[PDB]
Design a protein around this ligand. Sequence first.
Ligand SMILES: *[C@@H]1O[C@H](CO)[C@@H](O)[C@H](O)[C@H]1NC(C)=O
Length: 228
Amino acid sequence: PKVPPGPNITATYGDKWLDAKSTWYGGGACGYKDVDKPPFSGMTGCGNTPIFKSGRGCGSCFEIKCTKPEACSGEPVVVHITDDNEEPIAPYHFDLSGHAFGAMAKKGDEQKLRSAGELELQFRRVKCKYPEGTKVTFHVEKGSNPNYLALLVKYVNGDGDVVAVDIKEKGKDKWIELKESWGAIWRIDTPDKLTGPFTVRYTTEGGTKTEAEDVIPEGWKADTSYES
Ligand SMILES: *[C@@H]1O[C@H](CO)[C@@H](O)[C@H](O)[C@H]1NC(C)=O
């Protein structure tokens, strides 16, 4: 096979560090619920427009390091973007949670640092790392009836943002294309009842179409999460 081929020449997120202002806080736009519990575990933060990207960036994970105040470890920590930072104060502005903010400090200085209020950090997008056992969850948003479906596609550790979500009822052969809306909520209204079990197929930025067969059961209920 000759000599090992170097990395595939494909479009990708950088690998260089970007600069952003950072502050913290102690029902987000992305619709995530128990953020203190796994897989996020408090490692979350509000991200402004170029990070949130109207919702497309809800699963987003970023490495964030800090060298500014003395308490900063200079070591990187991964944060999951769970909301929208409507009031940015710099080109890039991360509004991290208290836990996340402090997580950039030297062992035991998490509070000393959290007292800094604002600081300058460096960040770069990275593939999320969820604890094993974590499965891509599809949440049927409330307001869904048998003629309207609106769902979230959580924990897709994929490469990029999911850019399309389709469903197929166990029995038919045509794909129903969902429309993207703010908060990464895919929606579809139809004349035909949305009864039978649906297979959800979501494709990521790359082009990688992955399917979750019959994940949404017949007789599903609004505001309920079903996993694969
Ligand atoms: C390059 O792309 C192919 C097809 O997706 C994949 O199987 C292969 O492992 C990739 N190579 C590297 C070095 O990542």
